[PDB]
Amino acid sequence: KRLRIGITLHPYYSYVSNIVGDKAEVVPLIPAGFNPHAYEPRAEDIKRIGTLDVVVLNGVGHDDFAERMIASSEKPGIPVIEANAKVPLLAATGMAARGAGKVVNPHTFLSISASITQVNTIARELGKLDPANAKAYTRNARAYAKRLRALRADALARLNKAPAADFRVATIHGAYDYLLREFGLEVTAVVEPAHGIEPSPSQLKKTIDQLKALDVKVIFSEIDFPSTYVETIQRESGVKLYSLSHISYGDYSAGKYEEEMARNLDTVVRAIQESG
Protein backbone atom coordinates (compact mmCIF):
# COMPACT_ATOMS: atom_id res chain seq x y z
CA LYS A 1 0.00 0.00 0.00
CA ARG A 2 -0.43 2.74 -1.79
CA LEU A 3 -2.25 1.62 -5.03
CA ARG A 4 0.02 1.48 -8.14
CA ILE A 5 -2.14 2.41 -11.21
CA GLY A 6 -0.89 1.74 -14.73
CA ILE A 7 -1.81 4.13 -17.59
CA THR A 8 -1.29 3.88 -21.42
CA LEU A 9 -1.88 7.39 -22.95
CA HIS A 10 -1.13 10.93 -21.55
CA PRO A 11 -4.88 11.93 -21.10
CA TYR A 12 -5.33 8.92 -18.78
CA TYR A 13 -2.34 10.02 -16.63
CA SER A 14 -4.20 13.36 -16.17
CA TYR A 15 -7.57 11.71 -15.27
CA VAL A 16 -6.00 9.25 -12.74
CA SER A 17 -3.63 11.89 -11.17
CA ASN A 18 -6.54 14.30 -10.67
CA ILE A 19 -8.75 11.47 -9.20
CA VAL A 20 -6.05 10.03 -6.79
CA GLY A 21 -3.83 13.00 -5.86
CA ASP A 22 -1.34 11.61 -3.28
CA LYS A 23 -3.58 8.60 -2.37
CA ALA A 24 -2.00 6.40 -5.15
CA GLU A 25 0.91 6.20 -7.68
CA VAL A 26 0.23 6.77 -11.42
CA VAL A 27 2.66 4.59 -13.43
CA PRO A 28 2.91 5.12 -17.26
CA LEU A 29 3.28 1.85 -19.22
CA ILE A 30 5.22 3.25 -22.22
CA PRO A 31 7.87 6.06 -22.09
CA ALA A 32 7.25 9.86 -22.42
CA GLY A 33 8.15 11.14 -25.90
CA PHE A 34 7.13 7.82 -27.49
CA ASN A 35 4.45 7.87 -30.20
CA PRO A 36 1.64 5.52 -29.15
CA HIS A 37 0.85 4.77 -32.85
CA ALA A 38 4.39 3.60 -33.48
CA TYR A 39 4.95 1.83 -30.12
CA GLU A 40 5.91 -1.84 -30.32
CA PRO A 41 5.97 -3.52 -26.82
CA ARG A 42 9.29 -3.78 -25.04
CA ALA A 43 10.40 -6.27 -22.38
CA GLU A 44 11.56 -3.14 -20.44
CA ASP A 45 7.98 -1.77 -20.00
CA ILE A 46 6.27 -5.28 -19.81
CA LYS A 47 8.53 -5.99 -16.73
CA ARG A 48 7.06 -3.04 -14.77
CA ILE A 49 3.44 -4.37 -15.00
CA GLY A 50 4.40 -6.89 -12.24
CA THR A 51 4.70 -3.90 -9.80
CA LEU A 52 1.09 -2.62 -10.51
CA ASP A 53 -2.25 -3.40 -8.83
CA VAL A 54 -4.53 -2.18 -11.69
CA VAL A 55 -4.17 -0.93 -15.34
CA VAL A 56 -6.47 1.78 -16.67
CA LEU A 57 -7.20 1.09 -20.38
CA ASN A 58 -8.87 3.13 -23.19
CA GLY A 59 -9.80 -0.41 -24.39
CA VAL A 60 -11.68 0.82 -27.51
CA GLY A 61 -8.69 0.75 -29.95
CA HIS A 62 -6.03 3.24 -28.80
CA ASP A 63 -3.96 0.99 -26.52
CA ASP A 64 -4.10 -2.61 -27.93
CA PHE A 65 -0.29 -2.73 -27.26
CA ALA A 66 -1.11 -2.63 -23.50
CA GLU A 67 -3.48 -5.65 -23.65
CA ARG A 68 -0.49 -7.57 -25.21
CA MET A 69 2.03 -6.20 -22.55
CA ILE A 70 -0.26 -7.41 -19.72
CA ALA A 71 -0.62 -10.83 -21.48
CA SER A 72 3.23 -11.13 -21.68
CA SER A 73 3.76 -9.97 -18.03
CA GLU A 74 4.04 -11.57 -14.52
CA LYS A 75 0.44 -10.41 -13.82
CA PRO A 76 -1.55 -11.49 -16.99
CA GLY A 77 -4.72 -11.55 -14.83
CA ILE A 78 -4.13 -8.01 -13.41
CA PRO A 79 -7.40 -6.08 -12.68
CA VAL A 80 -8.21 -3.84 -15.69
CA ILE A 81 -10.34 -0.66 -15.75
CA GLU A 82 -12.22 -0.37 -19.05
CA ALA A 83 -12.42 3.52 -18.92
CA ASN A 84 -14.80 3.61 -21.92
CA ALA A 85 -17.37 1.00 -20.62
CA LYS A 86 -20.03 3.75 -20.28
CA VAL A 87 -18.96 6.07 -23.16
CA PRO A 88 -21.24 6.08 -26.30
CA LEU A 89 -18.79 5.45 -29.18
CA LEU A 90 -18.76 7.05 -32.66
CA ALA A 91 -18.20 4.66 -35.61
CA ALA A 92 -15.69 6.91 -37.54
CA THR A 93 -14.43 4.85 -40.67
CA GLY A 94 -11.63 2.98 -41.04
CA MET A 95 -9.21 0.92 -40.08
CA ALA A 96 -9.50 0.84 -44.03
CA ALA A 97 -11.58 -1.84 -46.00
CA ARG A 98 -9.77 -5.22 -46.55
CA GLY A 99 -8.75 -5.28 -42.85
CA ALA A 100 -11.91 -4.16 -40.93
CA GLY A 101 -14.73 -2.19 -42.75
CA LYS A 102 -16.50 0.07 -40.17
CA VAL A 103 -14.91 0.24 -36.68
CA VAL A 104 -15.02 2.50 -33.59
CA ASN A 105 -13.24 5.88 -33.15
CA PRO A 106 -11.03 5.34 -30.00
CA HIS A 107 -10.40 9.08 -29.32
CA THR A 108 -13.09 9.43 -26.64
CA PHE A 109 -10.42 11.13 -24.55
CA LEU A 110 -10.57 14.20 -26.98
CA SER A 111 -14.16 14.98 -25.85
CA ILE A 112 -14.97 16.98 -22.69
CA SER A 113 -18.24 15.03 -21.98
CA ALA A 114 -16.73 11.57 -22.70
CA SER A 115 -13.74 12.58 -20.57
CA ILE A 116 -16.10 13.26 -17.61
CA THR A 117 -17.68 9.78 -18.19
CA GLN A 118 -14.18 8.14 -18.24
CA VAL A 119 -13.10 10.10 -15.05
CA ASN A 120 -16.31 8.83 -13.31
CA THR A 121 -15.76 5.17 -14.38
CA ILE A 122 -12.05 5.27 -13.18
CA ALA A 123 -12.95 6.93 -9.76
CA ARG A 124 -15.72 4.30 -9.19
CA GLU A 125 -13.52 1.28 -10.15
CA LEU A 126 -10.58 2.58 -8.05
CA GLY A 127 -13.04 3.17 -5.19
CA LYS A 128 -13.95 -0.57 -5.39
CA LEU A 129 -10.22 -1.55 -5.20
CA ASP A 130 -9.22 1.05 -2.53
CA PRO A 131 -12.40 1.41 -0.31
CA ALA A 132 -10.56 3.65 2.22
CA ASN A 133 -9.96 6.29 -0.54
CA ALA A 134 -13.32 5.78 -2.39
CA LYS A 135 -14.69 9.08 -0.94
CA ALA A 136 -11.50 11.06 -1.88
CA TYR A 137 -11.55 9.54 -5.41
CA THR A 138 -15.20 10.59 -5.92
CA ARG A 139 -14.66 14.14 -4.38
CA ASN A 140 -11.60 14.71 -6.67
CA ALA A 141 -13.45 13.29 -9.75
CA ARG A 142 -16.40 15.71 -9.21
CA ALA A 143 -14.01 18.69 -8.78
CA TYR A 144 -12.01 17.69 -11.96
CA ALA A 145 -15.28 17.37 -13.98
CA LYS A 146 -16.33 20.89 -12.81
CA ARG A 147 -13.00 22.26 -14.22
CA LEU A 148 -13.46 20.30 -17.48
CA ARG A 149 -17.03 21.64 -17.82
CA ALA A 150 -15.78 25.23 -17.15
CA LEU A 151 -12.96 24.81 -19.77
CA ARG A 152 -15.58 24.08 -22.54
CA ALA A 153 -18.04 26.78 -21.38
CA ASP A 154 -15.37 29.55 -21.30
CA ALA A 155 -14.10 28.52 -24.79
CA LEU A 156 -17.64 28.52 -26.34
CA ALA A 157 -18.16 31.88 -24.55
CA ARG A 158 -15.64 33.31 -27.09
CA LEU A 159 -17.84 32.25 -30.06
CA ASN A 160 -20.13 35.14 -31.19
CA LYS A 161 -21.94 33.32 -34.04
CA ALA A 162 -22.44 29.64 -34.95
CA PRO A 163 -20.52 28.38 -38.05
CA ALA A 164 -22.20 28.99 -41.44
CA ALA A 165 -23.97 26.07 -43.25
CA ASP A 166 -21.08 25.85 -45.85
CA PHE A 167 -18.44 25.55 -43.05
CA ARG A 168 -16.81 22.16 -43.73
CA VAL A 169 -13.86 20.87 -41.68
CA ALA A 170 -11.32 18.12 -42.48
CA THR A 171 -8.57 16.60 -40.28
CA ILE A 172 -5.29 14.75 -41.11
CA HIS A 173 -5.68 12.27 -38.18
CA GLY A 174 -9.17 10.96 -37.23
CA ALA A 175 -8.90 12.06 -33.60
CA TYR A 176 -11.25 15.09 -33.46
CA ASP A 177 -14.73 13.69 -34.28
CA TYR A 178 -15.65 13.78 -30.52
CA LEU A 179 -14.09 17.28 -29.97
CA LEU A 180 -15.98 18.76 -32.99
CA ARG A 181 -19.28 17.18 -31.84
CA GLU A 182 -18.96 19.57 -28.79
CA PHE A 183 -19.55 22.43 -31.29
CA GLY A 184 -22.35 20.54 -33.14
CA LEU A 185 -19.87 20.11 -36.04
CA GLU A 186 -19.07 17.14 -38.25
CA VAL A 187 -15.69 16.23 -39.87
CA THR A 188 -16.31 16.11 -43.67
CA ALA A 189 -13.15 14.09 -44.43
CA VAL A 190 -10.19 12.42 -42.69
CA VAL A 191 -6.97 12.38 -44.82
CA GLU A 192 -5.45 9.25 -43.16
CA PRO A 193 -7.17 6.19 -44.78
CA ALA A 194 -7.03 4.28 -41.45
CA HIS A 195 -5.97 5.19 -37.87
CA GLY A 196 -2.28 6.19 -37.91
CA ILE A 197 -1.80 5.12 -41.60
CA GLU A 198 -0.19 7.47 -44.12
CA PRO A 199 -2.18 7.80 -47.46
CA SER A 200 -0.58 6.70 -50.74
CA PRO A 201 0.12 9.46 -53.38
CA SER A 202 -3.09 8.31 -55.23
CA GLN A 203 -5.17 8.26 -51.96
CA LEU A 204 -3.94 11.82 -51.12
CA LYS A 205 -4.81 13.07 -54.67
CA LYS A 206 -8.38 11.61 -54.36
CA THR A 207 -8.80 13.35 -50.93
CA ILE A 208 -7.43 16.75 -52.23
CA ASP A 209 -9.93 16.45 -55.17
CA GLN A 210 -12.72 15.77 -52.57
CA LEU A 211 -11.77 18.85 -50.40
CA LYS A 212 -11.98 20.99 -53.59
CA ALA A 213 -15.26 19.42 -54.87
CA LEU A 214 -16.90 19.53 -51.35
CA ASP A 215 -15.55 23.06 -50.66
CA VAL A 216 -13.92 22.13 -47.31
CA LYS A 217 -12.92 25.36 -45.51
CA VAL A 218 -10.43 24.35 -42.78
CA ILE A 219 -8.01 21.40 -42.16
CA PHE A 220 -6.90 20.36 -38.66
CA SER A 221 -3.33 18.98 -38.68
CA GLU A 222 -1.11 17.47 -35.91
CA ILE A 223 1.06 19.39 -33.42
CA ASP A 224 2.27 16.16 -31.66
CA PHE A 225 3.72 13.94 -34.45
CA PRO A 226 3.20 16.03 -37.67
CA SER A 227 3.06 14.58 -41.20
CA THR A 228 5.24 15.46 -44.19
CA TYR A 229 2.29 15.82 -46.67
CA VAL A 230 0.30 18.63 -45.01
CA GLU A 231 2.08 21.38 -46.95
CA THR A 232 1.25 19.43 -50.23
CA ILE A 233 -2.51 19.69 -49.24
CA GLN A 234 -1.97 23.47 -48.60
CA ARG A 235 -0.12 23.78 -51.94
CA GLU A 236 -2.94 21.98 -53.85
CA SER A 237 -6.35 22.75 -52.21
CA GLY A 238 -6.22 26.34 -50.87
CA VAL A 239 -7.71 25.11 -47.54
CA LYS A 240 -6.88 27.07 -44.31
CA LEU A 241 -4.55 25.17 -41.95
CA TYR A 242 -5.00 24.93 -38.15
CA SER A 243 -3.30 22.46 -35.80
CA LEU A 244 -4.59 20.42 -32.88
CA SER A 245 -3.05 18.38 -30.05
CA HIS A 246 -3.72 14.61 -29.71
CA ILE A 247 -2.26 14.97 -26.10
CA SER A 248 0.47 12.26 -26.81
CA TYR A 249 3.77 14.13 -26.83
CA GLY A 250 6.13 15.07 -24.01
CA ASP A 251 6.17 14.51 -20.23
CA TYR A 252 3.23 13.03 -18.28
CA SER A 253 1.46 15.50 -15.97
CA ALA A 254 -1.89 16.02 -14.16
CA GLY A 255 -2.46 19.38 -15.89
CA LYS A 256 -1.53 18.20 -19.43
CA TYR A 257 -5.06 17.15 -20.47
CA GLU A 258 -6.85 20.39 -19.39
CA GLU A 259 -3.91 22.60 -20.67
CA GLU A 260 -3.98 21.07 -24.18
CA MET A 261 -7.82 20.72 -24.37
CA ALA A 262 -8.17 24.47 -23.60
CA ARG A 263 -5.76 25.22 -26.52
CA ASN A 264 -7.69 22.78 -28.82
CA LEU A 265 -11.10 24.34 -28.01
CA ASP A 266 -9.58 27.86 -28.57
CA THR A 267 -8.09 26.75 -31.96
CA VAL A 268 -11.53 25.43 -33.07
CA VAL A 269 -13.10 28.76 -31.93
CA ARG A 270 -10.39 30.74 -33.86
CA ALA A 271 -11.08 28.56 -37.00
CA ILE A 272 -14.87 29.36 -36.75
CA GLN A 273 -14.34 33.09 -35.94
CA GLU A 274 -11.85 33.30 -38.88
CA SER A 275 -14.58 31.88 -41.26
CA GLY A 276 -16.51 35.21 -40.93
Binding site for Mn ion (CB under 5 A): 1, 3, 18, 79, 81, 93-94, 125, 130, 140, 143-144, 172, 174-175, 177, 180, 186-187, 193, 195, 209, 213, 221-222, 226-227, 229-230, 253
Is 10 annotated as contributing to ligand binding?
no
Is 195 annotated as contributing to ligand binding?
yes
Q: How far is the CB of 128 from Mn ion (least distance, A)?
A: 7
* Cβ pair 112, 151 in contact under 8 A: yes
Spatial distance between the Cα atoms of 189 and 168, rounded to a whole number of angstroms: 9
Closer Cβ to Mn ion, 21 or 68, answer by number = 21
Closer Cβ to Mn ion, 15 or 144, answer by number = 144
**Secondary structure of residue 10 in the 3-state scheme:** helix
Which residue sits closest to Mn ion, CB atoms considered?
Answer: 174
Closer Cβ to Mn ion, 48 or 227, answer by number = 227
Closest C-alpha to 18, from 267, 252, 269, 179: 252
Closer Cβ to Mn ion, 2 or 43, answer by number = 2
Query: What are the DSSP calls for 238-249, one per residue?
Result: --EEEEE--S-S
Q: How far is the CB of 103 from Mn ion (least distance, A)?
A: 8
Spatial distance between the Cα atoms of 226 and 234, rounded to a whole number of angstroms: 14
**Burial state string for 179-211 with b = 16 or more CB within 10 A and e = fewer than 16:** bbbbbebebbbbbbbbbeeebeeeebeebbeeb
Closer Cβ to Mn ion, 93 or 120, answer by number = 93
Spatial distance between the Cα atoms of 102 and 30, rounded to a whole number of angstroms: 28
Residues at the annotated binding site for Mn(2+)? Answer: 37, 62, 107, 173, 195, 246
Residues at the annotated binding site? Answer: 37, 62, 107, 173, 195, 246
Residues at the annotated binding site for Fe(2+)? Answer: 37, 62, 107, 173, 195, 246
